[PDB]
Ligand binder design. Structure first.
Ligand SMILES: O=c1[nH]cnc2c1ncn2[C@@H]1O[C@H](COP(=O)(O)O)[C@@H](O)[C@H]1O
Ligand SMILES: O=c1[nH]cnc2c1ncn2[C@@H]1O[C@H](COP(=O)(O)O)[C@@H](O)[C@H]1O
Lengths: 204, 194
């Protein structure tokens, strides 16, 4: 019964999301069952890639607790300059000798996940896997597969549940698709204010 | 209810928390209603202070969407130095300027309030249009400096809680409920000679 004037439709609802997550969670706890996870010494370190995945991470770990999987929360922040490769915040502690699970919001071209994967993989972790809230499969620019996928979606601009558009709509409880209407009406006013060529460097 | 061997008693349950947040979300919406929050141009900037607030922040903004309050999520990360001033090291700053915007700092708990007062002052200097703070938990007696939040989800006694984002030795942040760590563990873990 939720509606968003700015959305063209609705891909998943809060509850639908909760279910798939609870599902993959269980599937994650089962794969690590024989790895000997332990609080304090051998936790499953979750590298939460800010900022798209903040919501998915909140719920994801809680679900993982329901299946008694000790985890350690790590938060890194990446950005774009393609692919979000500019590192703005790295992990708080070492990941060496630990089992790590990179938590990404949505893998599209995979340029980011691919980059983050090899990056941390070279930091000798006990093992490295990946989990993404959404997979766009048909958008890859490099070959990359996420160990765990919450849902596969068709190429479209999604927002909500942590996902965003110009830092907007992250707070939605549901995963909806931005109306191309707003995309245009919005960037046209953004790419405008941006071009405020204030470069008043009048040297001469 | 859930059983927690390492926990001594539960202070609040997910559902108990889900409720108090709605009421606080509600209040916030009532307060900022006369300002004119509008997406993109003038939203309620939430400065989520990693990492104790990762989970609180997540629910809070969803509850705020319910009362249809436009928000902008900013994630900042601080670190200690090794200071009776509260000074901390900035590891991650807001991506956008908070000047001329209404800001709401989202902290997980406020014991000594040293870090929070420092963060408050700092951002205060950046000329925001207004600046308030919302805390999941509060220990009014353990203040090492004068400070009062603007929205306290729940007041608590000077105990040592964990869960719902809060930690102990970088552990237990994933708990769904806020619980009190039993001494036996706090001591058995303090075998810091290795
Ligand atoms: O439809 C979308 N909506 C919002 N963000 C997106 C969307 N597609 C990709 N992203 C973001 O782009 C980042 C990098 O994607 P990739 O490098 O193409 O794998 C992801 O972590 C997301 O934050
Ligand atoms: O009872 C507690 N359990 C876990 N962490 C706590 C507790 N009390 C305070 N903290 C942490 O100590 C930090 C500093 O407190 P503040 O300066 O009063 O905000 C908080 O941001 C929390 O991360």
């Amino acid at each position: 019964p939720r509606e968003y004037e700015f959305a063209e439709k609705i891909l998943f609802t809060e509850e639908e999301i909760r279910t798939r997550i609870k599902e993959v969670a269980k599937r994650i706890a089962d794969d690590y069952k024989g790895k000997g996870l332990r609080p304090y010494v051998n936790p499953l370190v979750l590298i939460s890639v800010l900022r798209g995945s903040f919501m998915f991470t909140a719920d994801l770990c809680r679900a993982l607790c329901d299946f008694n999987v000790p985890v350690r929360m790590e938060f890194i922040c990446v950005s774009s300059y393609s692919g979000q490769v500019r590192m703005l915040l790295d992990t708080r502690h070492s990941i060496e000798g630990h089992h790590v699970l990179i938590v990404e919001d949505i893998v599209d071209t995979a340029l980011t996940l691919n980059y983050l994967y090899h990056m941390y993989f070279t930091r000798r972790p006990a093992s490295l896997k990946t989990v993404v809230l959404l997979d766009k499969r048909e958008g890859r620019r490099v070959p990359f597969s996420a160990d765990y996928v919450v849902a596969n979606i068709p190429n479209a601009f999604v927002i909500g549940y942590g996902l965003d558009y110009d830092d907007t709509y992250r707070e939605l409880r549901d995963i909806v698709v931005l109306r191309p209407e707003v995309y245009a009406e919005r960037e046209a006013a953004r790419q405008k204010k941006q071009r405020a060529i204030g470069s008043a460097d009048t040297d001469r």
